[PDB]
Design a protein around this ligand. Structure first.
Ligand code: 6RO
Length: 212
């Protein structure tokens, strides 16, 4: 059937939708279709064509109220890629508190992690019951499921600037150094490559967590 209303969604609303590039972009909701128990959402993008999307691949174009966000909530967030910025999907790992300076910790679908503000987040419209189950990468999916279900039990390694450790990249262990700690994240310098990455302090990419 063709619908005009579904839950709190209305045809003609402005929305964010997931493109095939896996980045999210502004558009208009132009149709809502049912087939038995299933629902699809037709979006016309501003600088593009059209897609027919599942409800977990559209997001509201406003910032979620804080009382609506939990550990495990499915969100789109500001993602830094060199000097460019995109909107990319993730899971809320921490809500604002004193130890994190009142920020949200995000675990992105590709395995990166970052702290963001409320003004950098958007809520996915129709998340799955197990919110992690639409994460395509299997290693990322299983790690996030374990994290969200074990929370608040969160093993982490205690690290200090200048400490030498081994860190994983592309299947092998690399000599590295702790440059800085910011709440639950550590900035690691890969010593051969002379470039850095922010990594979650409970990540199994840190050799002391791999061991456990
Ligand atoms: C969720 S996170 O710690 O930022 N990244 C991550 C992703 C995948 C694995 Cl197997 C381990 C860690």
């Amino acid at each position: 059937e063709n619908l005009y209303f579904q839950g709190d969604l209305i045809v003609s609303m402005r929305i964010l939708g997931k493109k095939r590039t896996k980045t999210w972009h502004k558009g208009t909701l132009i149709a809502i279709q049912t087939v038995g128990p299933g629902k699809k959402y037709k979006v016309k993008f501003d600088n593009k064509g059209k897609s027919l999307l599942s409800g977990n691949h559209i997001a509201y174009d406003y910032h979620p109220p804080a009382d609506k966000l939990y550990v495990g909530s499915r969100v789109v967030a500001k993602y830094k890629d060199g000097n460019q910025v995109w909107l990319y999907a993730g899971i809320v790992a921490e809500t604002p508190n004193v130890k994190n300076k009142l920020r949200f910790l995000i675990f992105f679908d590709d395995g990166y992690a970052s702290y963001v503000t409320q003004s950098e987040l958007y809520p996915i419209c129709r998340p799955l019951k197990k919110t992690w189950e639409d994460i395509e990468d299997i290693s990322c999916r299983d790690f996030i499921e374990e994290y969200v279900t074990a929370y608040p039990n969160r093993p982490m390694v205690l690290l200090k600037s200048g400490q030498l450790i081994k860190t994983e990249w592309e299947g092998t262990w690399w000599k590295s150094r702790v440059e800085e700690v910011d709440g639950s994240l550590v900035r690691i310098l890969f010593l051969d490559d002379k470039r850095c990455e922010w990594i979650y302090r409970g990540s199994t990419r840190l050799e002391p967590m791999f061991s456990m």
